[PDB]
Ligand binder design. Sequence first.
Ligand SMILES: [K+]
Ligand SMILES: [K+]
Ligand SMILES: [K+]
Ligand SMILES: [Mg+2]
Ligand SMILES: [Mg+2]
Length: 136
Amino acid sequence: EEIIWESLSVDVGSQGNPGIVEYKGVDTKTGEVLFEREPIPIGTNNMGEFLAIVHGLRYLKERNSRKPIYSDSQTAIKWVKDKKAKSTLVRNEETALIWKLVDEAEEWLNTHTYETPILKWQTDKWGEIKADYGRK
RNA sequence: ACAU
DNA sequence: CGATGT
Ligand SMILES: [K+]
Ligand SMILES: [K+]
Ligand SMILES: [K+]
Ligand SMILES: [Mg+2]
Ligand SMILES: [Mg+2]
């Protein structure tokens, strides 16, 4: 089982969980940063991992790329497959933004098609995903 | 247990 | 040590 180097890797970063959430996508081979989301003041790790995958799908579709996406998040991979982010985060004024983005990401999934493989990055074999924030 |  | 999730 080998790394598919012609791929996009994504990952969340946070200050607290729940806390300030951001995410980014990088070229797995080179580490080049292809997109970075502006920090969101309150979210969860899994909401961020979900948004990162969906952004990756939208990024690749816009560019007519068939590359797969790596994610280290078992949860977010499942949520994307299901087209449903099963977060426990309370909905209130301070979580409104992240929930708006999660709702809109789900909506995008429900109105678009893709063949992009969404693959588990095997951290136990390969070390940290290339999109990692180096904060742990 | 597993993944974050 | 704590949290988010299956
Ligand atoms: K990190
Ligand atoms: K990890
Ligand atoms: K647990
Ligand atoms: Mg991750
Ligand atoms: Mg990481």
